[PDB]
Amino acid sequence: MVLESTMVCVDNSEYMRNGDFLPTRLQAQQDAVNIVCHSKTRSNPENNVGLITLANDCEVLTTLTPDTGRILSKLHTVQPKGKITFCTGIRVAHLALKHRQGKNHKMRIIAFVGSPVEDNEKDLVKLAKRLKKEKVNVDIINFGEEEVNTEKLTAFVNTLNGKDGTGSHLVTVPPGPSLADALISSPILAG
């Protein structure tokens, strides 16, 4: 219904090395990106999807492509053997969106954070201000570690959602039943 290019941000840090979800936290985020990409593509057949990792560097394994299968395959063989670096990841994703094919696509990224973001609140707020400056609908989802929706993420979203901003919904996942329906009830209805 809405033209959009989404840069999903998968996590493969060492803090994804968790069993909070039954098989593996990484596997839970894997089918999370699978279902979210399926929903975005079937919602609008000309939408764009791309893949960004966040472990120790921000690889851009898959860029904006309407195809889903290739991003799904690249999602596998991810090997969560790193440490997250959130700020650089969102920077890379934002400029990747800046390189989007169609300019009518509303900018939006999907970010899967499963580790406590080690940063300073000042850089988070300045980055949120910059992202709001470019009219980008970042979407952040907290996974893994128990400090779910940290004050860092809260400030980041709120500054980015300054007075009903883009809709950077700070959804929370339970440490236990992180089932797909719990991963789609809030976002598909509203990010």
């Binding site: 390189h99 169609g102 300019k103 709001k132 400056k133 470019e134 009219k135």
Partner: protein, 155 residues
């Protein structure tokens, strides 16, 4: 209006390339595009960045960049052309424009047509306008009507 031998470039505008940054959701990009009292307003600060692409390459002569009389009309505009990638405000401030423009007050009125350096706009594919400041130095800027006067290169 418009000088003899030219035309309004509205039908040549490709909606797939149009993209405006820092716009309030209530005041859409089409408001400045359309010739109505409806206006485009920036949401974050006075700076704005609007990129318009065309179906076919076109040559520009003059622009009608007009807003309201409350001082929130633009005053300093950097025009870039044929941008291969979306434009960033930091670079747009840093980058040297194809043409810098100090919009005097008379430009903002309804009869305000701003001539452009026709030499540098002979192969325009997409034109990006970086509004750096407004007349009244408000926290936001309004654009009542924006368009382009020129002729197609007849691709």
């Amino acid at each position: 209006d418009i000088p003899k031998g030219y035309m309004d470039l509205m039908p040549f505008i490709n909606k797939a390339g149009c993209e405006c940054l820092n716009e309030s959701d209530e005041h859409g990009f089409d408001n400045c595009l359309r010739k109505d009292t409806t206006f485009l307003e920036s949401d974050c600060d006075e700076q704005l960045l609007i990129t318009v692409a065309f179906n076919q390459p076109v040559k520009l002569y003059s622009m009608k960049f007009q807003g309201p009389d409350n001082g929130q009309g633009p005053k300093y505009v950097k025009i870039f052309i044929n941008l291969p990638r979306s434009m960033d405000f930091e670079e747009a401030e840093r980058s040297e424009p194809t043409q810098a423009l100090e919009l005097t007050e008379d430009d903002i009125k309804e009869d305000g047509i701003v001539p452009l350096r026709y030499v540098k706009f002979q192969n325009v594919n997409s034109v990006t306008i970086f509004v750096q400041s407004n007349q009244g130095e408000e926290e936001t800027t309004r654009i009542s009507y924006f368009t382009f006067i020129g002729t197609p290169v007849q691709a």
